[PDB]
Symmetry: D2
Subunit: 268 residues, 4 copies
């Protein structure tokens, strides 16, 4: 198991990764890809709300990667007050986080301004931005203590090119990008790496969530295109975080070949 | 009184402007400037938390511009549940808003990530982003009914060029920009104008608020420079909103001559 | 004649403006607008290739603004070797330039990459970028000697949001923006103002030139929209350059109300 | 020899890469890295002006990668008239290009506007922009005929964040980005991948060229930092081009850990 070559595996070995939104889509793919690239030799902290999904993943990992160690954690990152204790209370074995993947995130609906539910505004901002920042602040001290660690934030093409009907989501991803940029500028005197991942169309549960479980509307987003799959973004994240320390794959835009922006999507 | 020429005064006359953060700084300057440019002939809705400051402004206006009509409103735009009623309950005379100026906003501290108080995060985001969106959604129906109206959003240079120690503020201003951009893209089939104003250094109460009333630290931000004053930004706002309808001064970055970015500030 | 109010007229009076592309469209509008805003009391240096068009304009100005002084100059700004002498040889009366408007510019064709004529590539880059820089370098010493002066560069929405079929033009306008931004950052220790004007659809001779004189294709670009007219952009330029010296209207995107990007253009 | 894992080697095998600026720095590193990742099993066309440097590289490759096939080409990409014939005249074996790496490029001096030699302006633009576009147009038909191929353009952090003293270079890299973006938007209906690589500080011959051979000034750019080495950027290029076809690593900013922008560079 060395999906990315020997040197990348060496660099990943024995590191501890904390992944938010590990129950599905990119987060889940990323947990698996980290093992593919390191010959199973890492420690994973998988956090999301759906505990069974996490358990199921751990079981999959357990048999596929005997030498992997996985700590499953039911956490709604929206519940601010639980973040700091969550970190402080990690089992000894998993306390020394090396890579934080702020992947948990969502979009709710495609309403034009004027039609947007206040709940949808709070939920998207709280999950995408506020929680991302809380989790970041709670982990950072670990990195600063040892002057090492990667902070990986999931932005989006929507974070640099806004589109109509996506005002809130775009506002949230623009925010994530900016926060990420300040952070990188603050840390230039450390060896802590700050990495922004910005995908276009990836077929996950993202569109299913976005349209409240309506499978029709979800599949329709990808109709007549070959979008990215979660493992494609996972591939990039593991790639970025397995570079030699001095290298920062700082900001990457990943697209399916048929897409060039939110407004430029070829449908065959 | 026609600070911007006859034609601009004609275009402004008898319009109703709603201004958030009218008690100080740019919002206050903007109320005054609208009158300077329209020969007093407008209707102003001035909202902020400090009711006395608003009253004082109204009194100033009352004697300076007898023909102006001013409705003062004590409102904390952060109290979401009060927004919709606020708009619906405007006195008949002021109900027909023509220009919305989403000016109320703030920055809290200059802490590097890791050191940022959760209250400061919520306050900045709620005031700068969430409330701006709520207020925008509450007013927009008025504009859509009559297919006219200007939406003016206070962004910042910080909204397109992030800087260390300003992660939250920058994140919030990037969000305001992106929301604004989505909005403009949604409304291209209307005659509703969407305008983003993005200043650099303006000497107001902004730095005083930012450093919790410490006048030392506040004055220090402007030390050895000649920053913009609030009437400079007011000038631009009134300029943008007094153009003929078909013209959209969509996005303007305004700088004092000694500044070229958050990182490029000459001190004499 | 004070289209922009008294204070703006005072600030413009007796200043010397150098305008490239004065024979048509925005450049021509801008010469006229400067006079509207200053009560005719300025000195204009109008440069372009079509000498009769310039003469015609001067004649118009001569009778409309008796107190204006206009120096007409047949110049192909693409002829680098003539730039420095051009400046150095201005008649005494016009030597002390206060405002440079780098307006001359064009786009040639709408060919996709693979189909682009080399002549069209050189012409667009030489006029839009190289000449702009040459002219800028030649005038700048005047401004540095007296520590004042405005440099106005015509960018475009295309300079920040590229679009298919416009690769060369967009590349050129991105370049103009970047050059402009470096410049502003270099001059923060001077009182020299650096101003970028970025329009969307303006109906001038721009599309006519772009499609090699084919009036059909030209009119077609504006079909079913109400684009900006050249005086709209002139209005903005005169506005920016008539602000008090300390204020820099640094970067303004101006759109007709039906447009929000090169990709978002409503046609009624 | 599979620096990036088996699957990536499979995807690279037997492909033909054309590399500009192969005689040194990133271009040279990239030729080497392609072989490291594919077990020597590719065909390289190495072009630059210094023929001996190319020969030397080929000799290195010949003994290190017996199964590699290398065509060396003395070419000044600035000589436009030679581009099309260059492509058309490639030996049969190397005619079917799969990957174009537009790497040749340079910066000349660090002069502020006003002090910039016209030769330096033409040389930078002709090499970085005009030649890049010419070479792109000449190779593209190959890709369109077979509906596959990667176009890799070397941009820079300078292409999205301009800095004083780098106006021309920045202008040139902004143009490369914009051209690149247009190109990707044009090709969404093909399976041709369009990839922008944007590094910060890499220690190559780049600074040596920039300061006309002065080793002092060159080494000084990197003093007290650990910059990226050419093989770091090579790694990213090979990574991007060895993804499965549907995946486009569209736009990647790569930094040494001590850098976060042109203005944010920590020196230890
Ligand atoms: N997929 C795309 O096309 C797209 C494009 C660009 C960027 N992105 C970004 O990439 C990230 C991952 O998206 P995705 O496509 O993988 O979405 P997804 O398939 O819907 O998964 C999102 C994950 O986040 C978790 N999550 C949501 N809210 C949470 C909360 N309050 N607390 C803890 N965990 C929470 C979910 O698990 P539970 O429900 O079990 O808690 C789920 O596992 C998001 O930030 C998204 O914005 C997505
Ligand atoms: N100063 C700068 O250099 C700078 C630069 C770029 C952009 N801006 C932006 O310009 C806008 C105005 O800033 P400024 O410099 O004029 O600031 P300021 O002088 O401190 O005034 C801000 C106004 O907002 C009001 N406000 C704050 N929170 C409120 C709330 N929760 N509910 C209702 N009103 C509230 C305040 O009034 P009350 O306390 O009475 O409620 C105050 O009148 C902000 O959006 C700011 O981000 C400032
Ligand atoms: N119109 C739009 O939709 C649009 C949008 C954004 C930006 N812009 C920009 O705004 C500026 C002016 O546009 P426009 O609409 O006014 O175009 P226009 O109507 O074609 O006029 C351009 C002017 O430049 C002059 N000119 C062209 N090449 C020249 C050369 N080589 N040497 C000297 N003068 C030259 C032309 O005069 P002669 O032929 O007589 O020399 C003409 O006066 C340009 O930078 C353009 O890129 C236009
Ligand atoms: N180094 C950095 O910090 C950095 C950062 C961002 C982007 N970049 C970009 O990365 C690319 C490579 O730069 P580098 O650091 O590798 O520079 P480098 O070490 O100086 O190499 C540049 C290469 O380009 C070739 N070249 C220059 N002009 C040419 C011409 N007219 N025709 C054919 N070949 C030519 C040179 O070969 P000959 O002299 O033999 O012709 C040399 O092989 C450039 O596009 C650069 O702008 C560099």
């Amino acid at each position: 198991h060395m999906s990315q070559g020997r040197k990348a595996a060496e660099r990943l070995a024995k590191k501890t990764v904390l992944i938010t939104g590990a129950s599905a889509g990119i987060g889940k793919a990323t947990a698996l890809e980290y093992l593919e690239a390191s010959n199973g030799d890492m420690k994973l902290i998988l956090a999301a709300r759906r505990l069974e999904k996490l358990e199921e993943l751990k079981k999959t990992i357990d048999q596929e990667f005997p030498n992997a160690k996985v700590h499953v954690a039911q956490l709604d990152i929206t519940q601010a007050e639980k973040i700091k204790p969550f970190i402080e209370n990690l089992p000894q074995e998993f306390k020394d986080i090396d890579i934080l993947v702020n992947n948990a995130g969502k979009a709710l609906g495609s309403d034009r301004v004027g039609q947007i539910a206040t709940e949808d505004i709070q939920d998207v901002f709280d999950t995408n931005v506020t929680a991302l920042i809380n989790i970041t602040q709670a982990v950072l001290p670990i990195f600063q203590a040892k002057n090492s660690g990667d902070i990986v934030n999931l932005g989006s093409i929507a974070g640099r090119d806004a589109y109509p009907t996506g005002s809130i989501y775009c506002a949230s991803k623009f925010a994530v990008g900016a926060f990420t940029d300040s952070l990188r500028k603050e840390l230039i005197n450390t060896k802590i790496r700050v990495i922004l991942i910005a995908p276009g169309l990836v077929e996950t549960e993202f569109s299913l969530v976005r349209y409240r479980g309506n499978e029709e509307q979800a599949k329709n987003v990808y109709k007549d295109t070959t979008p990215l799959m979660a493992d494609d973004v996972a591939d990039l994240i593991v790639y970025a975080t397995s570079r030699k320390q001095n290298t920062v794959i700082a900001d990457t835009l990943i697209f399916p070949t048929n897409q060039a922006s939110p407004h430029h999507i070829f449908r065959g």
